[PDB]
Amino acid sequence: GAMGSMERASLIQKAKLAEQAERYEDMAAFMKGAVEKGEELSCEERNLLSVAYKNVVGGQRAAWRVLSSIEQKSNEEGSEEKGPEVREYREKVETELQGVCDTVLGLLDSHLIKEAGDAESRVFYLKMKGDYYRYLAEVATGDDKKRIIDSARSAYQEAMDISKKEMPPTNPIRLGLALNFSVFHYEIANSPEEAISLAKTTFDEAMADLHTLSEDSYKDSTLIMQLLRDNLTLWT
Amino acid sequence: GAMGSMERASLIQKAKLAEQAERYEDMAAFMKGAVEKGEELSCEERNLLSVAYKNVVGGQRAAWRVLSSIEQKSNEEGSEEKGPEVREYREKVETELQGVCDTVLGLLDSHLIKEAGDAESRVFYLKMKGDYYRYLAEVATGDDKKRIIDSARSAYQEAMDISKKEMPPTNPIRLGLALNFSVFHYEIANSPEEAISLAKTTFDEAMADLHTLSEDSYKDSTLIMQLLRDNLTLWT
Amino acid sequence: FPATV
Amino acid sequence: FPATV
Ligand SMILES: N=C(N)c1cc(-c2cccc(NC(=O)[C@]3(Oc4ccc(Cl)cc4)CC[C@@H](N)CC3)c2)cs1
Ligand SMILES: N=C(N)c1cc(-c2cccc(NC(=O)[C@]3(Oc4ccc(Cl)cc4)CC[C@@H](N)CC3)c2)cs1
Fold this sequence. Notes:
- The complex is a heterotetramer, with two copies of chain A and two copies of chain C.
- Chain A has helices spanning 8-20, 24-35, 43-74, 85-115, 119-139, 145-166, 172-188, 192-207, 215-235.
- Chain A is an all-alpha fold.
- Chain A has a single domain (8-235), classed as 14-3-3 domain (Delta-Endotoxin, domain 1), CATH 1.20.190.20.
- In chain A, helix 1 (8-20) packs antiparallel against helix 2 (24-35), helix 4 runs antiparallel to helix 5 (119-139) and helix 6 runs antiparallel to helix 7.
- Chain C contains no helices and no strands.
- Classes of the chains: A mainly alpha, C little secondary structure.
- The interface between A and C is small, with 13 and 4 residues.
- One ligand RZT is lined by residues 19, 44, 47-48, 51, 124, 127, 172-173, 176, 223-224 of chain A.
């Protein structure tokens, strides 16, 4: 750990600075260093961790999609052979993406999830675990693809079970978990009907609980509800 | 050189792929590998090199500015001491920026400039040399700042002298060189009047030569002329 | 692509 | 910031 000599508090401070500078690779490295101090993460710290790696892997995924698109075209009937370079470079980006996912999954397994007892932390981390297995699933093609998919499903399912028992239906973590598990169903598990059912039921149960919220909590919940509706509009 | 085992043509192909994927660090690494094959660069290849490193250093510069701004505020009268972290992280980004600049300047010195005999290549590379010394100047504060500034000035001046002898006033390389040397005068050399004079004279000499151009060359030249006018509007 | 958070 | 290319 190249961050082993830096104070935990300094790592968190620098993660916030890296965010302001839109230096998300640095942000992720600082937050990995903070996790490796071994202490549990506060709510703010968990979100710094998730923001950092979401931005890093999001860029990798966007690049992979561009390259995969170019690669598939080079393989159509009538394309001029261009050699191994597109495949090689897609593989390079894919391997770096898998590395980032494995890093995040490693942090969750050593030892964030096992120490997470409160619903807000445990559901958050299990959602992340589902998310990063989902990103691995997006690029998987081998003997392991079904097992990667089932790892994502299992993490999301455990998070869902806890969230339904322990959080109100408007809790933004619960909502974001359902949003993403719904996308998993649609895009990974070839289960569009499950995706649509989950998004719709989540939206309706949240709507009925909005009356309990403050203005600020209302804004947070309705933002994610709008994403659920956006996806439903995309899919119907 | 980690690219030493890859074919020159494969490096150029992958640079173009990296560009499409907005992976500019990769793009720059591929083009550095291509330069290190030792052959001169074609027009397209020179622009791949410049696009890659301009994007990399541009992001570093934007980050440095954010962090420098935060640092200066932390040093105002009334600010709460936050410790060494802002300075340290600004220094980290600054050192990485200086490294990229030194890398580019190294490629130009070994041995792109000395092999560049045609005006279009030689002016292009000397403009780059001015640009990357200018980026070093932006962060310089020590015993070397004046010498860094004079290195930028000298490279720009040699490029200007060649461009005025060997290129028409509408040549986009000549125009972009003048644009950037004008910014050097305004932002680095504390010579706003020289900056304004150079931009205005460049614009007017180009305007008078537009009648010689094809529609496509006209579009290229007038685009950079509009940047000259934009800066003049900013400065007057 | 669909929205995720 | 001013324009450069
Ligand atoms: N970036 C930072 N420095 C910090 C961010 C936070 C912080 C703390 C609690 C919730 C949030 N919500 C979000 O990020 C957003 O909603 C989420 C995110 C994650 C989940 Cl599972 C659920 C909902 C806001 C709305 C956006 N469309 C999507 C992200 C941020 C503390 S610090
Ligand atoms: N990105 C790629 N794959 C490639 C780009 C090129 C290529 C070749 C010749 C000129 C250009 N001009 C430019 O880039 C732009 O003008 C310049 C750039 C550099 C100079 Cl010194 C002068 C003018 C177009 C207009 C933009 N506002 C600023 C950049 C690009 C070949 S390949």
